[PDB]
Amino acid sequence: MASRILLNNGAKMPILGLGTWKSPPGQVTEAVKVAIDVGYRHIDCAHVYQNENEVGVAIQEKLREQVVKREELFIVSKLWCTYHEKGLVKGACQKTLSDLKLDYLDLYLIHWPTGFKPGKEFFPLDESGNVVPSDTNILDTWAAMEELVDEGLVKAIGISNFNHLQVEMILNKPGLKYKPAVNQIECHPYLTQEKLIQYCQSKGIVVTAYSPLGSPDRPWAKPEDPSLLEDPRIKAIAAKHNKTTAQVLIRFPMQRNLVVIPKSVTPERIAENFKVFDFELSSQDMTTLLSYNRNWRVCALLSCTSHKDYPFHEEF
Numbered sequence: 001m002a003s004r005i006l007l008n009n010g011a012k013m014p015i016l017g018l019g020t021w022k023s024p025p026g027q028v029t030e031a032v033k034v035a036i037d038v039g040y041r042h043i044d045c046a047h048v049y050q051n052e053n054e055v056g057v058a059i060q061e062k063l064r065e066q067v068v069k070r071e072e073l074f075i076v077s078k079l080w081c082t083y084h085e086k087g088l089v090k091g092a093c094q095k096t097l098s099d100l101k102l103d104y105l106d107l108y109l110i111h112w113p114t115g116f117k118p119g120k121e122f123f124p125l126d127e128s129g130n131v132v133p134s135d136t137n138i139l140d141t142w143a144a145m146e147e148l149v150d151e152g153l154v155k156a157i158g159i160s161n162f163n164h165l166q167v168e169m170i171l172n173k174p175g176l177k178y179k180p181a182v183n184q185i186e187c188h189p190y191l192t193q194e195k196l197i198q199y200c201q202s203k204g205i206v207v208t209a210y211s212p213l214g215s216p217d218r219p220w221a222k223p224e225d226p227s228l229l230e231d232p233r234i235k236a237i238a239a240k241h242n243k244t245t246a247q248v249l250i251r252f253p254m255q256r257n258l259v260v261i262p263k264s265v266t267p268e269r270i271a272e273n274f275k276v277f278d279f280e281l282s283s284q285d286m287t288t289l290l291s292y293n294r295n296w297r298v299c300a301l302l303s304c305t306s307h308k309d310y311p312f313h314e315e316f
């Protein structure tokens, strides 16, 4: 299958990218180096992951080694929640650009719909544990994102963790300048996202699937949470194809016309995870994997459930 998907800005986005959340700076430079060597051309970043400097060190090295040119790369980052005020957006983007040593991003996302109180702390809480919101709204933050395209800092803008009504809010904004190009959402066999994918695709919004392996390294995991990589049913599908469970989990979203961004810092796994363009999951495989949906979320904070823009009260 084709390695890139067409966005609404006329640019092509690689359908397989490298995730970088929880890649420590002490290891992410080597990860990105290896990824580029083995063919990754999309890297998913964020300011909150606090490793964009080291990601940037890799891109620059590989540019200087003559391994890749900038136009071939597709670099994504995201505006953190403490920067939703219209006056903070450009500076947040420019900090990401400076850390990554880039002059533009291919795609810049509103990381979460929830604005948090501005300040140094990424998750400001009150005395008992709820996040402290900011008096920001989706539409004004979107307008600020649009300005970044009009100044040449970013080629495309999109959203992440937006429910369909939040997406609709942007689509229906009077005076909209740019439609979101992408909605990046959690998606895997335990959270198959049928209704939100159908919605987004029916708008020409491309969907990126995050945590496709179930984020086993997420820092809030409980031993009794369900584990995709160890699910014997998925292992059986992998065995039949002489592939790993991770390779099945990466191929799955690709066959749904999604982009997918598995994370690893392990060189062997980085290479493994890219070797998914040479087999196909059957109709039965696809149906079986979709049947495993449990509406189970890696990423959803309790602490954000009272925010006016918390995305996950809506069904989709």
Ligand SMILES: NC(=O)c1ccc[n+]([C@@H]2O[C@H](COP(=O)([O-])OP(=O)(O)OC[C@H]3O[C@@H](n4cnc5c(N)ncnc54)[C@H](OP(=O)(O)O)[C@@H]3O)[C@@H](O)[C@H]2O)c1
Residues within 6 Å of the ligand: 018, 019, 020, 021, 022, 044, 045, 111, 160, 161, 184, 185, 209, 210, 211, 212, 213, 214, 215, 216, 217, 218, 229, 244, 246, 247, 261, 262, 263, 264, 265, 266, 269, 270, 272, 273, 298, 299
């Ligand atoms: N927009 C958002 O709100 C949002 C939220 C979550 C995630 N994301 C993005 O999506 C990316 C991917 O999601 P994620 O990091 O949550 O988790 P993930 O990609 O589902 O899983 C990563 C974990 O799987 C392990 N792993 C990777 N390949 C493997 C393989 N072949 N065999 C066995 N284990 C393997 C990794 O270990 P090692 O690294 O130790 O090899 C790591 O512990 C993130 O890094 C981030 O870029 C975005």
Ligand SMILES: O=C(O)COc1cc(Cl)ccc1C(=O)NCc1cccc([N+](=O)[O-])c1
Residues within 6 Å of the ligand: 021, 046, 048, 049, 050, 081, 112, 114, 299, 300, 301, 302, 304, 310, 311
């Ligand atoms: O968000 C990501 O990309 C991955 O998750 C991260 C990463 C970092 Cl470095 C720190 C914390 C998180 C995290 O708790 N994200 C979840 C989250 C955040 C904001 C709002 C919500 N919410 O539910 O409204 C949820």
